[PDB]
C-alpha cells in the first residue's frame, strides 16, 4: 500500500499540473470552435435575410 | 559450472546491446527531427502548426524502433529464451 | 520482482486459454467508446452549438478526412474513414486510462495494477494489426482484382528489388503491431520499475513518467491511424 | 537550350538561345544548363557572364550590379550595366582596376574577366 | 514466460473491436459526416 | 564441464542482441533523416505534404525492411539456435 | 565457480553498454538541436523566444531516452534479474 | 566445454556483428538517399519521375551491400567453416 | 577468484561507459561549435548573443557526459555485488 | 581443450567484425554519394552524364574497401594463421 | 588461475574502450569544427581573424574531453584499482 | 589451454576489429568526399577538371589511414606480439 | 590453469585493436569532413584556394593528432603490455 500511496500522490500531482496548465487552453479552443460555428450560423441567417 | 550463470550473463550482455542500439537510434532520430523542426520554424514562423504533424510521425518511427528494442530487452532479461 | 507477463484472471475455454485481464480492459474501453457514441447521437446538434463530445468527434473526423484526402480520394474508399477512425479512439483510451491510479501492492513485495492497458498485451496489438492487414489487402484485391494484387505488390516500384517489396508487405503488419506493444509495454514495465523506489520518493518519478506516457500513447495512436490510412492508400492505386 | 535575356535598366542588352551560362555569384560560381531548377542569385561585384551557344563562339559580358534569375523556360540577368567583350578596352580596364573607388575597380575587374586578362 | 506467444485473447479481443467498428460505421461516422457536409 | 548448450545459447543471445541493436540503430537514423527531409520540404512547400507523404514512406518502408529482416534472423537465432 | 560473480560481471557490462548508447544518443541529439537553435539565432536574432519551445521539446525527448537508459542501468546493476 | 559449442557460439557472434553492421549501413544509406529524393521532389514536383532512377540505383547498391552480408552470415550459421 | 572476475567486468564496463561518454561529448561540442562558427561568420556582432544558446547546448551535453562519468566512478571505485 | 576450437571462434568473431565494418562503410558511402547524385540530378538534369562518372569514382572507392574487407574475411574464415 | 591476470586484462580492455571513444569524439568533432571554419573562411576571405576564437574554444572543449579520457585510461592501465 | 591458441585468437579478433574500424572510416570519408565532388560538379559541370585534385588529396588522406590499419592488422595476424 | 602471460597478452592485443579501430574511424570521419569543406570551397571560390589550405591543414592536422597519438598507446599495449 506504500507504493499505492506514492502512486496516488503522483496521480494527484499530474492531475494538478494538467488542470493548471492544459485544461484552460483546451477549454479556450473548445469555446473558440463553438463561437466560430455559432457565428457561421448567424452569418447564414443574415445572408438569407440579405 | 552452473550453466545458469553463463546464460544469465549472455542475456545481460544481449540486453545491454539492445539498449545501446535503441538509445543511439532514438537520440539521433530525435535530434535530427528536432533540428528540422527548428529550422522550419525559424525560416517560416507561419508554419508552426503545419510542421508539427510530420515531426510527430518521424518521432513515431524512431521511438517505435527504440521501444521495440525495449520490448525485446524485456523479453531477453526477464523471460530468457532457451533457459 | 517485476513479473512480466503472468496475466491475471486467465481462464481456459473450448480447450484453449484466454487472458481475462486484457479482455476486461478491452471491454472497458469498448463500453466507454459506446457511451461516447450514444452521447453523440443523442446530443448531435447540427444547427445548434455543438457540445464537447460533438466537437471532439467532429475534430477527429475532419482531421482524419484531411489525411485520407491527402493520401487518396475519399470517394474511392469511404469505408476507410470509419474502419480506422475507431483505431484512433480505441487505442487512445486504452492508453489514457493507464493514467488512473490502479497500482497497488500484491502482498508479494511487488507492484500490481488492477487495470493493465490492453495494448500492453501482445494479443491486442496482434489482433489489431492482423485485422488491418486483412482489411487493406482485401481492399487492394477489390481495387485491382485478386490476381492483380500479388503481381502489383511483387513488381512494386522496381522489379529488380522484388524481394524487399515482399518483405515490405510482411513488414506492414508487424511494424504496426510491435511498436504499439512497445509504446505501451515499456510503460507497464516502467511504472512497476518505478514502484521499486520508496513511495515518498517514488511519487515524483511516477508522476513524470505518467505525464510522458499520456503523450506517448496519444502520439502512438495518431501514428497508428495515419499508418493505417497510408497502407490502405498504397494498396489502393492504379 | 535555354533562352538567355541580359536586360539592363536603361535598355535590354542581349536576348537569345544558349546552351550554357557560367557566372560568379555571392554564393559562388554557378553554371546553368537548359533544365536548371528555378533560382535567384546576386552576382559578385566583379562578376563576369560567359554564355555558350551553338553555332557561335562563347560570349563574355562584364556586368555591374547583375542579378541572375533562372526559370524552367528562360533565364534573365538584371544588370545595372553590361558590356560585351568585343568593345572592351584593355588600357581603360587596367586603369580602372584597383581604384580607390570600389565601383570603378569592380567594373574594371569585370571588364578584364570578360576579356580574359582577369 | 514468453508473453509474446499468441493467446486466445487475440480472437476474443478481436470480436469486441469488430462490434465497436460496427457501432462507429453506422451511428457515429455517417451522422457526423452528414453534419459536416451540411455545415 | 559446463553444459555446451548453455554456451551456445549465450552466444546466440549476444549475437541476436547485436543483430537487432544494429538494426535499430540503422532504422532510427534513417527514419530521422527522412523525417528531416520531410520537415524541410513541408516548410518549403506548404501544400506539398500530401504528395510528399508517399515518397517519405517509400523510404521509410525501405529502411524498416532491413530492421525487420534483422529482427526475423534475431528470432531465428534465439527461438531456435542453428544446431543448438 | 560462483554463479553470482559471472552474473554480476554480465550485468555490469550490460549496464555499461546501456550508458554508452545513452551517452552517444543524448550528446548527439542535444548537439544537433543546439546547432539548429544557433543557426536560427544567427539568421534571426529576434526569433529566440519562438525557437526555444522546439528546442525544449527535442531536449525533453532526448533526455527522456537518456534517463530511461539510466533507469534500466540502475535496474541491471542494483537488481539484476535472475541473480 | 565441448569445442563445437564454442565454434558455434563464435559463429553466432560473428553473425550478430555481420547483420548489425549490414542493418546499420542499409538503414543509413536508405535514409540519406530518401532525404535527397524528398528534397529534390519538394523542389520539383514533376521531377520525381526522373529522380527515382538514381535513387533506386543507390537503394539497390546499398541493399546489395546488405545482401552480401546476409549471404555470408548465412554461410557462418548454415555451414560454419572449420567446425 | 570470483572477485577478480567481478572487478575485471566492472573495469570493462566503466571503460565502455566513458568511451561512449567521450564520443557523445566530443561530437556534441563539435556540432555546437560548427553552428557557432557559422553564426559568427554570418555576422561578427552575433558572437555575444550566440553564446547563450551555444552555452546552453554545450552545458546540456557535458551534463550527460559528467553524469556518465559519475556512474563510471560508481562502477569502478565501488564494485556493486562484489 | 582443443586449440583449434578457440582459433576458429576467434576467427569467426574477427570475420564478423570485418563484415560489420565493411557493410557500414559501403552502405554509408553509397548513401552519401547517392544523396549527392540525387541533389545534382534534381538541380541539373542535363548534367547526369558528367555526374554519374564522379559518382561511379566515389562508389568504386568505397566498394574497393568493402570488397577488400570481404577478401580478408575469406582469409580469416578459410586460412587463419596459427590454426 | 591468477586473479591479477584477469584484472589486468579487464583493465586493458577498458582502456582500449576509453581510447576508442576518445579518438572517435576528438577526431570527428574537430573535423566538423574544421569544416565549419573552412566554410566560413571561404565565404568570408578575412573572417579568419574573428573566427579562430570560437573554433579554438570548440576544439579546446573537445580536446579537454579527449585528454580527460587519456588521463583516465592511464589511471586504469597503470593504477588498476582492485588488483 | 594452449597459450598460443588464446593469444592467436585474441590477435585475430583485434585485427578483425582493426579492419572493421578502418573500413568504416575509409568508406564513409570516401562517400563524403564523393558527395562534395558531386555537389561541386552539379553546381558547375566544367569544374571537375580542377575539382579532381582536392578530391584526390582527401582520398589520399583517408586511404592512408585505411592502409595504415591494414599494415597494423597484418602485423597482428602474422607477427603476433608476445606470442 | 591458463598462464598469466597468455591472458594478459590477449587482453592487450584486443585493447590495442580497439585503440586503432576508434582512431581509424575518427580519422576517416574527420578527413572526409574537412575534404568536403575544401571541395565545396574550391567548387565555389577557386581564387580562395591559397587562403583556404591554411585552415584546412590546421584542422586536418588536429584530426590526425589523436589518431597518430594512438600509436604510442597501442605500442605500449601490444609490445610493452604494462604488468605483463
Swiss-Prot record, chain A:
Transmembrane segments: 3-23
Function: F(1)F(0) ATP synthase produces ATP from ADP in the presence of a proton or sodium gradient. F-type ATPases consist of two structural domains, F(1) containing the extramembraneous catalytic core and F(0) containing the membrane proton channel, linked together by a central stalk and a peripheral stalk. During catalysis, ATP synthesis in the catalytic domain of F(1) is coupled via a rotary mechanism of the central stalk subunits to proton translocation. This fusion protein includes a component of the F(0) channel (subunit b) and of the F(1) subunit (subunit delta). Two copies of subunit b and one of delta together form the peripheral 'stator' stalk which links F(1) to F(0).
Superkingdom to which the source organism belongs: Bacteria
Organism in which the protein naturally occurs: Mycolicibacterium smegmatis (strain ATCC 700084 / mc(2)155)
Protein name stated in the entry: ATP synthase subunit b-delta
Quaternary structure note: F-type ATPases have 2 components, F(1) - the catalytic core - and F(0) - the membrane proton channel. F(1) has five subunits: alpha(3), beta(3), gamma(1), delta(1), epsilon(1). F(0) has three main subunits: a(1), b(2) and c(10-14). The alpha and beta chains form an alternating ring which encloses part of the gamma chain. F(1) is attached to F(0) by a central stalk formed by the gamma and epsilon chains, while a peripheral stalk is formed by the delta and b chains.
Compartments, as annotated in UniProt: Cell membrane
Residues of the full protein shown: 1 to 50 of 445
Extra facts: Binds 2-aminothiazole antibiotics, which are antitubercular agents.
Family that this chain belongs to: In the N-terminal section; belongs to the ATPase B chain family. In the C-terminal section; belongs to the ATPase delta chain family.
From Swiss-Prot, chain D:
Similarity field: Belongs to the ATPase epsilon chain family.
Entry keyword Ion transport: yes
HAMAP family hit by this protein: ATP_synth_epsil_bac
Protein known as: ATP synthase epsilon chain
Topology within the bilayer: Peripheral membrane protein
A GO MF term: proton-transporting ATP synthase activity, rotational mechanism
Gene Ontology CC annotation, any one: proton-transporting ATP synthase complex
Subunit structure: F-type ATPases have 2 components, CF(1) - the catalytic core - and CF(0) - the membrane proton channel. CF(1) has five subunits: alpha(3), beta(3), gamma(1), delta(1), epsilon(1). CF(0) has three main subunits: a, b and c.
Record localization: Cell membrane
Entry keyword annotation includes Cell membrane: yes
PANTHER family assigned: ATP SYNTHASE DELTA/EPSILON CHAIN, ATP SYNTHASE EPSILON CHAIN, CHLOROPLASTIC
The gene coding this protein: atpC
Protein purpose: Produces ATP from ADP in the presence of a proton gradient across the membrane.
This protein's UniProt keywords: ATP synthesis, Cell membrane, CF(1), Hydrogen ion transport, Ion transport, Membrane, Transport
The species this protein was found in: Mycolicibacterium smegmatis (strain ATCC 700084 / mc(2)155)
Swiss-Prot record, chain E:
Positions spanned in the full protein: 22 to 60 of 170
Compartments, record wording: Cell membrane
Gene it is expressed from: atpF
Transmembrane segments: 4-24
Role according to the record: F(1)F(0) ATP synthase produces ATP from ADP in the presence of a proton or sodium gradient. F-type ATPases consist of two structural domains, F(1) containing the extramembraneous catalytic core and F(0) containing the membrane proton channel, linked together by a central stalk and a peripheral stalk. During catalysis, ATP synthesis in the catalytic domain of F(1) is coupled via a rotary mechanism of the central stalk subunits to proton translocation. Component of the F(0) channel, it forms part of the peripheral stalk, linking F(1) to F(0).
Subunit structure: F-type ATPases have 2 components, F(1) - the catalytic core - and F(0) - the membrane proton channel. F(1) has five subunits: alpha(3), beta(3), gamma(1), delta(1), epsilon(1). F(0) has three main subunits: a(1), b(2) and c(10-14). The alpha and beta chains form an alternating ring which encloses part of the gamma chain. F(1) is attached to F(0) by a central stalk formed by the gamma and epsilon chains, while a peripheral stalk is formed by the delta and b chains.
Record organism: Mycolicibacterium smegmatis (strain ATCC 700084 / mc(2)155)
Highest taxon above the source species: Bacteria
Protein name: ATP synthase subunit b
Family the entry assigns: Belongs to the ATPase B chain family.
